[PDB]
């Protein structure tokens, strides 16, 4: 029973190994996180926008992702492409409004 | 009393013990808070997003809660279910807005 | 030249004395902040919505 502290260009978060590494297909669930890991400070630094990463954390928490309404799409698209998320699992209502 | 420094999937929050205990029938008021107690780190990890936790703490502050207009309802009702919070207590104007 | 760290039910912030105490009419600019001050932790705790 261990949880790690990972920071994304500022605000940090606490994640369990099983929750974060249950989707090996995405870069988050692979070993590339160790590339972003910084053992010198015991932190996993991603250096990205610290609001969409929160949505990705909620998605991994529940298995379903939602799209922020005030973060637009040309900021959401870049984050979902950099993080390698699947854009076809982002909720049901949120999927429709994001597509619209 | 004491301002317990607890973080919920990221940033931390502190609030008095009695203010937390004003709703003992809820998960936080009852002994489930001790079940989430982490004496090794002196925090109460809920594995829940801090955004909805802010509204939950606002509810534990007073007799009224408010629902923001932007975030999706699904995650909000999920957080309501996990915290054991009743859904017919979420303000009055915000209640009808959530209803529609 | 000194700035204080004040926390409001969680997330904390850094404020200069002149900026925070330039409006004495409001409770923030008065001495009641010392009532919310916690010298035991060197923090000014308000415990409100952040």
């Amino acid at each position: 029973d261990a949880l790690i502290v990972l920071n994304v260009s500022g605000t940090r978060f606490q994640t369990w190994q099983d929750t974060l590494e249950r989707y090996p297909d995405t870069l988050l669930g692979s070993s590339e996180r160790d590339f972003f890991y910084h053992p010198e400070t015991q932190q996993y630094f991603f250096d990205r926008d610290p609001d969409i990463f929160r949505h990705i954390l909620n998605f991994y928490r529940t298995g379903k992702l939602h799209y922020p309404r005030h973060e637009c799409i040309s900021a959401y698209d870049e984050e979902l492409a950099f993080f390698g998320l699947i854009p076809e699992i982002i909720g049901d209502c949120c999927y429709e409004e994001y597509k619209d």
Side-chain angles (χ1 to χ4, degrees), chain A residues 28-41:
Chain A
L28 292 98
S30 76
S31 314
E32 270 78 3
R33 35 167 291 181
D34 291 331
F35 199 102
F36 294 122
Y37 179 48
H38 292 262
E40 54 270 21
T41 75

Side-chain angles (χ1 to χ4, degrees), chain A residues 2-48:
Chain A
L3 73 164
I4 52 165
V5 174
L6 75 171
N7 48 3
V8 61
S9 86
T11 57
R12 81 292 183 276
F13 310 88
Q14 291 81 13
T15 54
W16 307 92
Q17 296 294 321
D18 60 350
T19 294
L20 188 152
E21 293 177 350
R22 61 197 274 179
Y23 276 39
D25 46 332
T26 318
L27 281 194
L28 292 98
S30 76
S31 314
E32 270 78 3
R33 35 167 291 181
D34 291 331
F35 199 102
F36 294 122
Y37 179 48
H38 292 262
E40 54 270 21
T41 75
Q42 210 64 252
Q43 305 167 342
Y44 296 75
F45 211 96
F46 291 78
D47 210 37
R48 287 303 297 213

Side-chain angles (χ1 to χ4, degrees), chain A residues 29-86:
Chain A
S30 76
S31 314
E32 270 78 3
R33 35 167 291 181
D34 291 331
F35 199 102
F36 294 122
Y37 179 48
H38 292 262
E40 54 270 21
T41 75
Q42 210 64 252
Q43 305 167 342
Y44 296 75
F45 211 96
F46 291 78
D47 210 37
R48 287 303 297 213
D49 174 272
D51 282 323
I52 292 165
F53 177 83
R54 299 180 296 109
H55 278 257
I56 305 174
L57 182 62
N58 283 346
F59 155 66
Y60 281 141
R61 272 177 52 256
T62 78
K64 191 163 84 63
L65 181 46
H66 283 288
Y67 161 61
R69 198 64 41 74
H70 43 96
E71 207 77 2
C72 78
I73 64 155
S74 50
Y76 199 60
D77 291 331
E78 270 73 351
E79 293 293 328
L80 66 88
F82 178 85
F83 264 86
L85 273 296
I86 310 303

